[PDB]
């Protein structure tokens, strides 16, 4: 504390704190009123003293300390956020009283002084509390600070420390069983399904086992995210002596004080004067402790020595009861625990394993009740109804396994079984429903979403704590129904599909060139496939053992039966869920991605992904199973403008730049764009690039139409109608771009070899490229396409800071055509000097190799004459010339392949059919076909009406899945 009003303009945000660890420490208090005012030393919070106030009823002492309370807008423009003056301190009762502490603010109070504003605490406790209000807020209608005794309790004793003024952000002052604040986090309110499952030897068995599983993947290895471990016994006792934790004679604890990460604002920590940072800075984070709980309590489980194994079990307990005694119980807010999971998780999870001792020390009601408690910030999921927000990502990530820690710690038996009963009907809906609008969850089509749309970075933690949770689960009356088990599969072998083992950079969220990668999710596969109704999965069992590096020899004794490891998938799937396709051959896989009105084109945040805009600008990132980094995906140096496949306009960083300082989630201009698959195998990509009528750096007028369709070795790339405001001046289409490296040092144009670096070169039609990662590009539309290995400047997506690097590329020039540029080019992902020799060959023979048999701005049709399948892009409904398709009514890809004896037909719009708020509806699309067909089988939900001549289809497009039919000629 200092000579100056609390809150003073030489610094308003500097707090000002009676710690009593400061000369005169009572200079500021006068008694008076039947009170004695002394220091203690067997107690504190901030430093090693206290203040011991002794009273008798309606008795009061008095702080005298000016204040110049600043405003709630005063406070907000201070600090730079939403803010108001606060006071707090801290108070401990060795035994709880019947009446209520008055805390009053005025000019110059003395006892018969009734004057201005104030607030009660109730005192029907033991132990330290927190007492926090906003003085512009809080109060029931300045120098005196005057603390007031219950008038109708005959005498007592409290202690006090801490007294504090501050600038606290104003969201945070919580009410609890002491004070009542403007604000108010309800408690839990359990619900419970019916009919309930008896207390019965099995059902308390099977709750017994699921603890005991918990309690194994705790402490048998299997590496947690956001755990720091600590498994050396040395070490551990080292911190907890460090905590200076003692027992005091008559109930209590003295010991470093303990606060979490988020409470730690109300001191304004920065701001504070060099005394009290001082003495700030030995208070200890709650994170780290209860890290350190757990690190115990899984040294206890695994303790061999009896003696070390009973000191690391006192270790537990004591570090329970100074928590508790700190304030950490029932009823007491602390003034806040916002963030709670962040500083508590490994606390519940640290109970399942010290269950028996906590009970046996008579801590668990005590533990319970608590975490309970302050659980309450959580009571969207933990309260266990089933609603539209109950499949959010992040809870399977951060706090599923904690949620069903605290039911296992309910000490009544029937309760307990109730809870986890209600918890498995709760954990089965949030897996099997389907979220409407962008809400998050899991998806029929298996994309997998948060913030709104698929986003394999939460997907994937999330994909591995509910197999987790399903695997602990499994084979008890609890068991996760099998539709959640269904559905959790499908997003899992999707997730297999589109990684390799990292998803591709269109995937990878605000976090391009760290893409998550499946091999984070091996240990889901196992479990999932371990969980299954029949273990186990053999599909999900084989993708473990490829993902993990694992043998069939291996495989025996891991799932019970000989499992051949996965091969990588081949073929093509459909994922319009984020408006892309996957297409794989070999050991390559190509992510073609667009996006729309339902799907944003990128995530940008103030300092993540500042150049993402085009991330999904119909773009086709080809990479090898193995490191992206390592096949010349470098950030340094990487131009932000050439995304593998995408029609960009190539700007200055400083252009490109997301236009919003802050978020930008850039959705699309209408409904349809993105992917359909025929038999398992092709794919087509149909991409409108439309921009917004009037968003800053981004041109109204630029325009494209971009298709591709894959099929076996090869993609053939087409694009017409693109324009843009400046006669298509900048406007690329990127071949490749990669980094050189001794591994990636060769460029094949025409048959030679191209090491030197810098090179320049320009192609055309006819010509040729092979890139460093085998990829062959053969020139086929185009007049002007540029060949570049350069030294590269560029900026790093978080910060914006410069980075460099070398890199071969190559893009189309489309500033040759000042109106509806187009190009045609085709990869070729086994390609060698020979093989591009005879593709190019092929291509000079009539164009051998396809036939662009529409090509503007209503309809794209690509013939594959290698795979003998056809693609048809209806960018709008239209009546086409064709032999196969005659006409279709909505926006759709459609695709065809004539083999034998048959024609299949596969349909579907990428268009979502929903909104942020509105779950997805079926499109009717109906397809007439040229002649008269009839159906080649039965196991098909398309419908088919011949009329005349030819042959009507309704196909039902849900959720962007494609649908396909059979079919064979009618005489
Ligand atoms: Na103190």
């Given at each position: 504390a200092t000579s100056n009003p609390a809150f003073d303009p030489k610094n308003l945000m500097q707090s000002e704190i009676y710690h009593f660890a400061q000369n005169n420490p009572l200079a500021d208090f006068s008694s008076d009123k039947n009170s004695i005012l002394t220091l203690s030393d067997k107690r504190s919070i901030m430093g090693n003293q206290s203040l011991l106030w002794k009273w008798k009823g309606g008795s009061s002492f008095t702080l005298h300390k000016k204040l110049i309370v600043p405003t709630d807008k005063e406070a907000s423009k201070a600090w730079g956020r939403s803010s108001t003056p606060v006071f707090s301190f801290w108070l401990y009762n060795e035994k709880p009283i019947d009446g209520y502490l008055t805390i009053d603010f005025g000019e110059?109070?003395?006892?018969?002084s009734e004057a201005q504003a104030g607030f009660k605490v109730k005192l029907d406790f033991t132990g330290w509390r927190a007492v926090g209000v906003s003085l512009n807020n809080d109060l029931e209608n300045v120098d005196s600070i005057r603390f007031k005794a219950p008038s109708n309790v005959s005498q007592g004793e409290i202690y006090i420390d801490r007294i504090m003024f501050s600038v606290d952000?104003?969201?945070?002052?919580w009410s609890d069983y002491q004070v009542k604040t403007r604000l108010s986090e309800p408690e839990i309110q359990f619900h419970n399904v019916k009919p309930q499952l008896p207390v019965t030897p099995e059902n308390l068995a099977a709750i017994d086992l699921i603890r005991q599983r918990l309690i194994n993947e705790f402490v048998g290895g299997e590496k947690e995210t956001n755990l720091a471990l600590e498994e050396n016994i040395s070490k551990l006792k080292s911190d907890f002596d460090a905590l200076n934790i003692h027992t005091l004679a008559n109930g209590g604890t003295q010991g470093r004080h303990l606060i979490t990460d988020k409470q730690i604002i109300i001191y304004q920590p920065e701001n504070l004067n060099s005394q009290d940072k001082q003495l700030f800075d030995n208070y200890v984070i709650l994170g780290n402790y209860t890290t350190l709980m757990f690190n115990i309590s899984r040294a206890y489980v695994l303790e061999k020595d009896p003696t070390q194994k009973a000191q690391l079990k006192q270790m537990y307990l004591l570090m329970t009861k100074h928590l508790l005694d700190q304030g950490f119980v029932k009823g007491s807010a602390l003034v806040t625990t916002h963030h709670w999971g962040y500083s508590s998780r490994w606390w519940y999870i640290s109970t399942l394993l010290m269950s028996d001792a906590l009970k046996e020390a008579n801590l668990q009601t005590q533990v319970y009740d608590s975490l309970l408690w302050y659980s309450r910030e959580f009571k969207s999921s933990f309260d266990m109804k089933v609603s539209a927000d109950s499949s959010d990502l992040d809870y399977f990530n951060t706090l599923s396994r904690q949620h069903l820690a605290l039911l296992l710690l309910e000490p009544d038996d029937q309760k307990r079984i109730n809870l986890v009963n209600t918890f498995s009907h709760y954990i089965t809906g949030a897996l099997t429903q389907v979220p409407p609008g962008g809400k998050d969850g899991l998806r029929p089509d298996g994309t997998a979403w948060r913030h709104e749309g698929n986003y394999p970075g939460y997907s994937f933690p999330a994909f591995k704590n509910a197999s987790q949770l399903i695997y602990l689960l499994?084979?008890?009356?609890f068991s996760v129904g099998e539709s959640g088990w269904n559905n959790l599969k499908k997003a899992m072998v999707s997730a297999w599909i589109y990684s390799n083992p990292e998803v591709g950079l269109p995937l990878a969220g605000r976090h391009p060139f760290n893409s998550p990668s499946l091999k984070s999710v091996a240990q889901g596969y196992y479990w999932l496939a371990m969980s299954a109704k029949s273990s186990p999965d053999k599909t999900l069992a084989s993708i473990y053992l490829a993902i993990s590096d694992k043998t069939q020899n291996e495989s025996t004794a891991i799932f019970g039966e000989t499992i051949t490891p996965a091969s990588l998938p081949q073929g093509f799937y459909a994922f319009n869920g984020g408006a892309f396709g996957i297409h794989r051959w070999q050991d390559k896989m190509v992510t073609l991605k667009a996006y729309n009105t339902n799907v944003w084109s990128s995530e940008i945040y103030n300092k993540d992904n500042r150049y993402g805009r085009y991330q999904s600008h119909g773009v086709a990132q080809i990479v090898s199973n193995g490191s992206q980094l390592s096949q010349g995906y470098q950030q340094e140096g990487w131009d932000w403008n050439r995304m593998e496949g995408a029609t960009t306009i190539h700007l200055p960083l400083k252009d490109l730049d997301s236009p919003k300082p802050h978020t930008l989630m850039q959705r699309g201009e209408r409904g349809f764009s993105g992917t359909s698959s025929l038999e398992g195998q092709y794919g087509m990509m149909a991409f409108n690039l439309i921009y917004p009528a009037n968003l800053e750096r981004f041109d109204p007028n630029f325009t494209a139409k971009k298709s591709v369709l894959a099929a076996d070795n090869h993609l053939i790339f087409i694009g017409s109608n693109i324009n843009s405001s400046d006669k298509n001046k900048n406007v690329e289409t990127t071949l490749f771009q990669h980094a050189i490296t001794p591994t990636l040092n060769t460029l094949w144009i025409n048959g030679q070899k191209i090491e030197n670096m810098p090179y320049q070169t320009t192609l055309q039609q006819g010509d040729w490229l092979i890139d460093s990662n085998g990829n062959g590009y053969l020139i086929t539309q185009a007049e002007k396409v540029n060949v570049s290995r350069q030294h590269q400047v560029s900026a790093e997506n978080k910060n914006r800071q410069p980075t460099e690097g070398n890199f071969s590329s190559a893009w189309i020039d489309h500033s040759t055509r000042p109106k509806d540029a187009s190009y045609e080019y085709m990869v070729f992902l086994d390609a060698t000097p020979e093989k591009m020799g005879e593709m190019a060959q092929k291509f000079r023979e009539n164009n051998g190799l396809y036939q662009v048999l529409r090509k503007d701005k209503d309809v794209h049709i690509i013939l594959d004459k290698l795979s003998n399948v056809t693609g048809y892009a209806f960018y709008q409904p239209a009546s086409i010339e064709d032999k196969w398709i005659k006409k279709v009514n909505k926006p759709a890809i459609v695709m065809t392949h004539r083999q034998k004896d048959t024609l299949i037909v596969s349909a579907v719009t990428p268009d979502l059919n929903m909104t942020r708020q509105k779950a997805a509806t079926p499109v009717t699309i109906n397809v007439t076909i040229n002649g008269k067909w009839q159906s080649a089988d039965k196991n098909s939900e398309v419908k088919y009406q011949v009329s005349g001549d030819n042959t009507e289809l309704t196909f039902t497009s849900y959720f962007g899945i494609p649908q396909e039919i059979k079919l064979s000629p009618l005489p």
């Open positions: 110059k109070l003395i006892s018969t952000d104003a969201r945070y002052q499994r084979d008890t009356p």
